Structure formats: structure tokens, C-alpha cells
Amino acid sequence: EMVETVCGPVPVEQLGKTLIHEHFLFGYPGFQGDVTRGTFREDESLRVAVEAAEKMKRHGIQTVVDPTPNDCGRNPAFLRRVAEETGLNIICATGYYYEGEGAPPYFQFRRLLGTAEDDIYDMFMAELTEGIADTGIKAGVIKLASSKGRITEYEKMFFRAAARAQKETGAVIITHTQEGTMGPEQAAYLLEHGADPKKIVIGHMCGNTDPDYHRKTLAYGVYIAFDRFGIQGMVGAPTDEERVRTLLALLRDGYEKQIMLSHDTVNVWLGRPFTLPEPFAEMMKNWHVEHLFVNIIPALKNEGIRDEVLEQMFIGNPAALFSA
């Protein structure tokens, strides 16, 4: 009845209103090489991350799951500073990103050595049950990710190791799907290797606008996340209007106990700062941690979605997910 947060064990019944997928920090693999022009400025980054946490608190959020992959700049000690300052519960992940935008050379080399899959399992177990580096922080979820239209041989090593670690620990699995593909396949593959559907969240499901695709995924008994609200135009993403359309169809079908919502924000980008071209910039203007509460939830309520359904998604579902 406990879950590991960046501040240690917290009762699952105390998690309350939760955002299932947000990043305080994130960097695309390779950001480390641009350190000269893209140095991590700790004080300012903490100020920004604390501000994001305070914005979430204003809307009643008590818990955030931050599934930043190990190869994408994950910094549990930094998350702990945010949580210590704000009182927000933050749950972090153990896992690597998908092959296309991850850093596969390292575990590809170890695959050639014959140890990669066992090494990954060993990493998962260490980070779930002992601690991440010298931080003393345990991950509360395993992060998995697949490529567009396939789960690659590289990715499958992590999927199998995740299923094994889940069987041993009861840990929650959170996933990334790329461009609205592989939802059913991820669920099928994980269950095939003994993972518990009630402990799995198939992510970025809002990337697909065909409700039959979602129904196919939901039939495995897993949770799904519409976790990219505010992301429009980029990353192959549909519009928020399309996201809302798909979500309403599923809620009207009675799937509320399997659905969670988030933004997948990046509050501090690692590496060099940037600005989106006016094309994407305007389309992306709502990509921030208050968007669900200021814009999306009101749009849902304008479409007849009741408070009890909303509370199921934000409070009931995370509580069930993290409970044995």
C-alpha cells in the first residue's frame, strides 16, 4: 500500500489528484555534447520546476509521475529538491527511451557481448528496490518505449526485462507509443511475458484518433493515457480537438476506469535553448501544466462529462494503479 517517491515511501491512498506523465527536466540524447552553449543552470532550472509544481498545486494536484528515461537526462536528486520545496509527491522511472530517439549504442554493444537483457533487468531491480546511483531514491515505475510501427529487437530486451522485474516487485509499467502505433502490441507482448495488465499504462494513446484502436488496447485490461494534451502539429500529434473527440467516445462507452490524462510537458529543456517557428509555436501555445485544468476539463464538462468521471480518472485510477 506504499509507492516509492523521490522523497521515499508514500501511502498510495495519499497520492490524491495525479498527473500521470509530465517531465520537470528532459533532454534528447546528445544534449550532453552541447554542454558549452547548453549548460544546465541549477538555480534557474529549480526556480522554473518549482513554479511548474506550484501551478499544478493550484489546481489540486498532489502527485506527478515523471517518467523521464535514464538516457534522456533523468535527475532524481533534482526532482527531490522540487518535492522538498513544494510538498508535491513526485514518482520517477527506471527505463530507456525508444530506439529512434534514445541512446541505443551502449546496450546494443552489451547485446553483442551477450549480457544486455540481464544487465537491464539488474538495473531495473537495483533502481526499484535499492536506489538510483547515490541518491537513495527508488524508482516507482518502469518506463518502456517502442518505435513507429514496431517494437524493435533492442526495445524488446527492455520489455522482457520489465515484465520480469514487474513479476518480482509488483512495479507499475508506464509506456511511450510512437505516433499512435503499437498500443495493442505492447499490451499483448507484456502480458505474454507475464506482466499484470492492472499494473500497465499504455502511453501516448491520444496519438491515435481511431477509437477502435483504443478499444483493441483496452480489451487487454490495461490502462491507457491521453497524456499529450497541448502538443499539436509536432511529433506527428493530432489536435486537442481530435484528442477530445476520441476521449469522449471512450468515456461514453464506459471506459473511465482505464483512462488517465496528462500533458507530457517538458518544463526545463536540457541542452541549448530554442524557439519553435511561428508555424509550430502558435500550435504549441497550450503545452503547459495548467492546460488540462484551464481548457480541457472545461471542454469536457461542456460536453456533459461529470465530476465523478473526472475524479475517477485523476484520483481513483492512479490509486488503483499503484495498489496491489
CB of 57 to a copy of itself, least distance (A): 30
Has 143 been labeled as part of a binding site? yes
SS3 assignment, position 220: coil
CB of 167 to Co ion, least distance (A): 24
The crossing angle, in degrees rounded to 10, of helices 211-218 and 183-192 is 10
Q: Which stretch binds a copy of itself (CB under 8 A): 64-72, 188-196, 255-263, 310-318?
A: 64-72
* Alpha helix ranges (H) inside the chain: 42-58, 76-86, 105-113, 116-129, 153-169, 183-192, 211-218, 240-252, 278-283, 291, 297-301, 307-311, 317-322
CB of 134 to Co ion, least distance (A): 25
Cβ contact 140:79 at 8 Å: no
Is residue 264 within the footprint of a copy of itself (CB under 8 A)? Answer: no
CB of 204 to Co ion, least distance (A): 6
All 3 cell numbers of residue 7?
522523497
Q: Is the four-CA dihedral 265, 268, 270, 276 of positive or negative sign?
A: positive
Please state whether 206 falls in left (phi above 0), alpha (psi between -120 and 50) or beta.
Answer: alpha
Is residue 278 within the footprint of a copy of itself (CB under 8 A)? Answer: no
2 binds, among Co ion, a copy of itself, none (CB under 5 to 8 A by kind): none
Is residue 273 within the footprint of a copy of itself (CB under 8 A)? Answer: no
Q: Is the four-CA dihedral 133, 324, 321, 193 of positive or negative sign?
A: positive
176 binds, among Co ion, a copy of itself, none (CB under 5 to 8 A by kind): Co ion
Is residue 264 within the footprint of Co ion (CB under 5 A)? Answer: yes
DSSP state of 139: P
Q: How many CB atoms lie within 10 A of CB 255?
A: 16
Has 291 been labeled as part of a binding site? no
Is residue 31 within the footprint of a copy of itself (CB under 8 A)? Answer: yes
Is residue 233 within the footprint of a copy of itself (CB under 8 A)? Answer: no
Question: Looking up cell 485490461, which residue turns up?
Answer: 221
DSSP state of 135: S
Is residue 101 within the footprint of Co ion (CB under 5 A)? Answer: no
Among 2, 113, 219, 294, binds a copy of itself (CB under 8 A): 113
Is residue 67 within the footprint of a copy of itself (CB under 8 A)? Answer: no
264 binds, among Co ion, a copy of itself, none (CB under 5 to 8 A by kind): Co ion
The half-sphere exposure of 249 on its side-chain side, counting CA atoms within 13 A, is: 16
Of residues 235, 231, 253, the one with CA closest to residue 243: 231
Q: Which stretch binds Co ion (CB under 5 A): 36-44, 117-125, 149-157, 170-178?
A: 170-178
Hey, which residues does 176 pair with through a beta bridge?
145
Q: How many CB atoms lie within 10 A of CB 107?
A: 23
Question: Looking up cell 546528445, which residue turns up?
Answer: 30
CB of 171 to Co ion, least distance (A): 18
Is residue 155 within the footprint of Co ion (CB under 5 A)? Answer: no
Q: Which stretch binds a copy of itself (CB under 8 A): 6-14, 51-59, 97-105, 171-179?
A: 97-105
Among 138, 160, 176, 263, binds Co ion (CB under 5 A): 176
Q: Give me the residues that bind Co ion (CB under 5 A), please.
A: 176, 264
Q: Which residues are annotated as a binding site for Mn(2+)?
A: 143, 176, 204, 264
Q: Give me the residues that bind a copy of itself (CB under 8 A), please.
A: 27-37, 39, 69-71, 74, 96, 100-110, 113-115, 119, 122-123, 126-127, 130-134, 271-272, 274, 276-277
